[PDB]
Amino acid sequence: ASRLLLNNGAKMPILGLGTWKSPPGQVTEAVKVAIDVGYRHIDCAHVYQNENEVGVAIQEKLREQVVKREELFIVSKLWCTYHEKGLVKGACQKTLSDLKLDYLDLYLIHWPTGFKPGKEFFPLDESGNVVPSDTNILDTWAAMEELVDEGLVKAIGISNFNHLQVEMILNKPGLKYKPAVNQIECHPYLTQEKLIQYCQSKGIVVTAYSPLGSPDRPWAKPEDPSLLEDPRIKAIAAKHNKTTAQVLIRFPMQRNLVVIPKSVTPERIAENFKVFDFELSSQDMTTLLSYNRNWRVCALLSCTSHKDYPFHEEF
Ligand SMILES: NC(=O)c1ccc[n+]([C@@H]2O[C@H](COP(=O)([O-])OP(=O)(O)OC[C@H]3O[C@@H](n4cnc5c(N)ncnc54)[C@H](OP(=O)(O)O)[C@@H]3O)[C@@H](O)[C@H]2O)c1
Numbered sequence: 001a002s003r004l005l006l007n008n009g010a011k012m013p014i015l016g017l018g019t020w021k022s023p024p025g026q027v028t029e030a031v032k033v034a035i036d037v038g039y040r041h042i043d044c045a046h047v048y049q050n051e052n053e054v055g056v057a058i059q060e061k062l063r064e065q066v067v068k069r070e071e072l073f074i075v076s077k078l079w080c081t082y083h084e085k086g087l088v089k090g091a092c093q094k095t096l097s098d099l100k101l102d103y104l105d106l107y108l109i110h111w112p113t114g115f116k117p118g119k120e121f122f123p124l125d126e127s128g129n130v131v132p133s134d135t136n137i138l139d140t141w142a143a144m145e146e147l148v149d150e151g152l153v154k155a156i157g158i159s160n161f162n163h164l165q166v167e168m169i170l171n172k173p174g175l176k177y178k179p180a181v182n183q184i185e186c187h188p189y190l191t192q193e194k195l196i197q198y199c200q201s202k203g204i205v206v207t208a209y210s211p212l213g214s215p216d217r218p219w220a221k222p223e224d225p226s227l228l229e230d231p232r233i234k235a236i237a238a239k240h241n242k243t244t245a246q247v248l249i250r251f252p253m254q255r256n257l258v259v260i261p262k263s264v265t266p267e268r269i270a271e272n273f274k275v276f277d278f279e280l281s282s283q284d285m286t287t288l289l290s291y292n293r294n295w296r297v298c299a300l301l302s303c304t305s306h307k308d309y310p311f312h313e314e315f
């Protein structure tokens with residue numbers, strides 16, 4: 001239960017450490033602490049601008065022999081400005097460089113939406129809108145498949161894909177490698193029952209991101225819902241003598257999901273690990289599910305008119 005079996009035969013640790021918003025000056029210590037504490041799965045991305053510093057931590061713990069490379073499960077993601085078939089290998093290689101590794105365990109397409117290649121992560125026109133690429137999902141998928149054949153990555157997957165977009169890849173003529181993982185937003189306010197049931201029926205593992213509601217998202221507001229401070233969730237935690245964070249992390253785990261909470265605080269990274277040793281009742285689970293309000297932290301709102309925008313479909 002500490003690891004789930006992927007369709008490529010590998011085993012993915014059900015708990016991982018997230019690194020979006022982890023400042024460069026703090027994330028090396030954060031990752032060293034996590035590995036020491038017993039984390040074996042780190043979620044990364046080129047767009048987080050801190051992979052070099054994550055890589056410093058991974059190298060220090062490998063050199064120290066705290067972990068063997070084979071025990072670690074390192075994830076990164078292909079950013080939207082590199083969807084072109086000819087840019088994919090290079091994007092993967094730059095991430096490998098920064099992280100100081102010679103293969104990734106899992107490489108995800110970060111969003112289904114391709115943007116204009118360039119130095120800008122969000123290329124804008126003079127009208128301030130995001131300039132798309134004309135690339136499609138299937139071509140980018142074909143490029144990702146040959147990363148597997150080249151030995152650069154062990155498995156490939158997708159992130160923020162809706163079920164029709166997953167369908168598209170699954171029905172691709174001559175599909176060689178299925179998506180191993182779809183990483184999506186999921187917590188009590190966005191429970192994702194339909195999509196999770198869809199992916200799990202197709203043998204695709206689901207990873208829940210922003211499990212605590214991403215209280216540090218740069219676009220946060222005061223009137224905004226807060227999971228960590230929902231009295232109903234505080235109550236379920238009190239009953240178990242756990243923290244509301246530990247309840248919010250255990251919740252996806254009991255849905256057979258992988259979950260990747262972010263912290264750069266050593267006490268919280270430790271607190272977040274102690275979630276293997278208790279059980280939410282079925283009443284707790286059904287209750288937590290009933291809190292769904294279809295509320296999204298990450299709606300990629302600047303791309304709502306992109307041909308590949310994922311969140312117009314029901315699921
Ligand atoms: N695929 C995608 O498009 C996508 C999108 C969003 C997220 N993700 C991944 O999912 C990871 C997690 O999502 P996220 O960063 O949005 O947020 P999250 O994990 O839901 O929340 C992180 C926030 O919770 C705080 N926190 C962590 N543990 C806590 C605890 N024990 N008690 C109180 N506060 C706690 C953290 O503070 P401190 O850090 O100060 O402790 C941080 O401010 C990301 O870092 C990224 O790796 C992927």
Ligand SMILES: O=P(O)(O)OC[C@H]1O[C@@H](O)[C@H](O)[C@@H](O)[C@@H]1O
Nearest residue numbers: 020045047048110121218298300
């Ligand atoms: O950074 P992620 O949430 O993993 O997804 C990628 C992008 O989407 C949102 O978060 C913002 O527009 C940026 O902070 C980021 O460049």
